[PDB]
Amino acid sequence: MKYHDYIWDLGGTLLDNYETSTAAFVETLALYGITQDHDSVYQALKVSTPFAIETFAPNLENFLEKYKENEARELEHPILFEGVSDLLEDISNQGGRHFLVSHRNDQVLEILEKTSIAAYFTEVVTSSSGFKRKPNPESMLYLREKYQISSGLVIGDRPIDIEAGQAAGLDTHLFTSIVNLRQVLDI
Numbered sequence: 073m074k075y076h077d078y079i080w081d082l083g084g085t086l087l088d089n090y091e092t093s094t095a096a097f098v099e100t101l102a103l104y105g106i107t108q109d110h111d112s113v114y115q116a117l118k119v120s121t122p123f124a125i126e127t128f129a130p131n132l133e134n135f136l137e138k139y140k141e142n143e144a145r146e147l148e149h150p151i152l153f154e155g156v157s158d159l160l161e162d163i164s165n166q167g168g169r170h171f172l173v174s175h176r177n178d179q180v181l182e183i184l185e186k187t188s189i190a191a192y193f194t195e196v197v198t199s200s201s202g203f204k205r206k207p208n209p210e211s212m213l214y215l216r217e218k219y220q221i222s223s224g225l226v227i228g229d230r231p232i233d234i235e236a237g238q239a240a241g242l243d244t245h246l247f248t249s250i251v252n253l254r255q256v257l258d259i
């Protein structure tokens with residue numbers, strides 16, 4: 073068991089936020105009589121919302137407003153990446169601890185409840201903890217000190233996650249899939 077402590081990222085790592093957003097974006101396009109495929113919309117949103125709108129909905133009246141309403145509805149039932157809860161469990165079964173660092177406010181906590189993974193986290197750091205944003209290592213150094221982390225892995229989907237982890241003296245994993253993370257961990 074290579075690491076004891078796991079410092080997670082939510083969006084793009086545990087939470088498939090682009091899936092719920094894609095569902096909302098595709099359904100909003102349909103209101104205007106427009107069909108676009110899942111994979112194109114998903115990739116466009118991963119670039120940015122302005123890119124997705126300029127690409128697929130540049131002159132659709134009230135599109136953003138309606139899209140955001142549909143997205144909020146989708147997020148009544150957020151979607152984790154496939155296999156997340158089983159991986160969290162396998163790690164916890166070996167005595168591992170899970171932490172979460174987010175730049176978002178305390179809505180994070182609602183998402184963890186709705187997806188039934190709140191029980192996994194020893195501590196969830198949100199913006200209300202007052203720390204600087206990644207890639208600044210402040211929040212991960214706080215966790216390292218408070219929880220006396222000697223064997224920690226920082227998992228996130230973006231460069232800033234890796235940079236924060238490195239600057240905090242922790243090993244990192246650039247998340248692409250749950251299966252691949254399992255392969256790296258032998259678990």
Ligand SMILES: [Ca+2]
Binds near residue numbers: 082229
């Ligand atoms: Ca992320």
